[PDB]
Amino acid sequence: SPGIWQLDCTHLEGKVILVAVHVASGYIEAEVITGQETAYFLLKLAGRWPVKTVHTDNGSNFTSTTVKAACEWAGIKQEFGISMNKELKKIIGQVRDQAEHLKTAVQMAVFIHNKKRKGGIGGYSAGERIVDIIATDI
Amino acid sequence: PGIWQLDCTHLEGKVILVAVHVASGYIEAEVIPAGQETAYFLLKLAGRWPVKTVHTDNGSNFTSTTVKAACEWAGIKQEFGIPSMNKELKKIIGQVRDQAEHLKTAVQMAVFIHNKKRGYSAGERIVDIIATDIET
Numbered sequence: 540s541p542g543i544w545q546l547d548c549t550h551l552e553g554k555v556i557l558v559a560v561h562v563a564s565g566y567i568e569a570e571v572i573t574g575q576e577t578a579y580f581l582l583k584l585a586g587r588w589p590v591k592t593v594h595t596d597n598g599s600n601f602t603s604t605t606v607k608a609a610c611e612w613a614g615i616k617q618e619f620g621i622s623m624n625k626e627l628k629k630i631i632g633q634v635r636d637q638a639e640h641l642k643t644a645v646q647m648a649v650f651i652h653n654k655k656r657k658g659g660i661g662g663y664s665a666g667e668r669i670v671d672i673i674a675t676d677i
Numbered sequence: 678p679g680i681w682q683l684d685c686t687h688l689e690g691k692v693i694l695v696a697v698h699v700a701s702g703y704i705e706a707e708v709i710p711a712g713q714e715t716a717y718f719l720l721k722l723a724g725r726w727p728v729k730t731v732h733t734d735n736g737s738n739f740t741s742t743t744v745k746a747a748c749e750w751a752g753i754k755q756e757f758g759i760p761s762m763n764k765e766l767k768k769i770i771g772q773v774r775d776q777a778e779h780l781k782t783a784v785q786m787a788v789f790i791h792n793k794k795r796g797y798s799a800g801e802r803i804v805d806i807i808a809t810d811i812e813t
């Protein structure tokens with residue numbers, strides 16, 4: 540399906556970073572932020588992309604009433620079961636000194652990750668590959 | 678293919694930034710409190726879509742050093758001149774407001790509906806446009 544996503548956390552400078560990965564493309568979305576936050580992030584993601592199954596690898600998202608409500612409102616299947624976060628952190632480090640706010644540095648890192656080619660030359664970036672995948676499916 | 682329109686609207690004493698992909702009608706929006714907020718939103722947007730030129734039709738975004746820095750970092754052309762998306766959105770926000778406690782949430786439910794509804798939704802259109810364009 541073009542709507543398969545993986546959701547995970549990572550931590551950096553004492554803050555928490557939601558990271559969603561489009562499994563087939565490698566495209567990512569992240570935010571520096573609870574259940575209300577995750578639910579808001581999911582709704583925002585689902586209004587932008589086809590989001591029809593989200594995988595997580597622990598239990599935390601199965602115990603949030605608002606996540607479950609988001610889910611139902613948007614038509615997203617929660618599914619259990621499945622590093623990108625360490626590639627992400629390494630770019631965040633390349634740029635950390637270009638912004639005051641970590642969350643700015645996170646978004647610069649997201650930008651680079653989604654716009655760069657694999658190996659730095661040839662082929663489609665994750666950003667092109669998610670759009671390609673979706674444009675083929677419709 | 679990368680041309681956008683940026684604007685402000687207001688509800689419940691808050692500010693909603695709205696970006697519109699001009700060719701498709703696709704929109705993104707966020708509730709802010711506010712130049713630092715706008716720059717962050719423009720950086721996020723450019724990491725997801727081709728963002729080449731952003732149109733606005735007042736002077737507010739030309740007076741932010743952070744917006745100017747975001748434009749330079751992401752490679753986005755600020756351009757002046759912007760020739761009723763905000764009133765279609767506030768409609769839908771009204772249709773859902775009682776389903777969310779936060780206006781924030783309701784804005785995002787309105788964006789969802791606006792982009793997914795109809796031949797082709799704005800959300801399919803922006804992808805069609807961009808996918809037709811990577812092929813060219």
Ligand SMILES: Cc1ccc2oc(C#Cc3cccc(C(=O)NCCN4CCN(C(=O)c5cccc(C#Cc6oc7ccc(C)cc7c6CC(=O)O)c5)CC4)c3)c(CC(=O)O)c2c1
Binds near residue numbers: 575637778
């Ligand atoms: C059924 C259902 C479904 C979904 C649901 O969802 C919810 C919910 C909720 C909830 C509550 C509270 C908060 C949130 C939330 O997540 N907000 C988004 C977070 N954030 C807020 C607003 N902001 C911020 O202030 C903020 C803070 C710090 C820094 C910045 C910046 C920057 C910045 O950029 C740059 C770019 C380029 C350059 C060159 C420089 C810069 C710079 C500056 C620099 O470096 O020099 C922005 C940015 C983003 C969500 C419900 C509950 C309900 O309704 O029932 C619900 C129910």
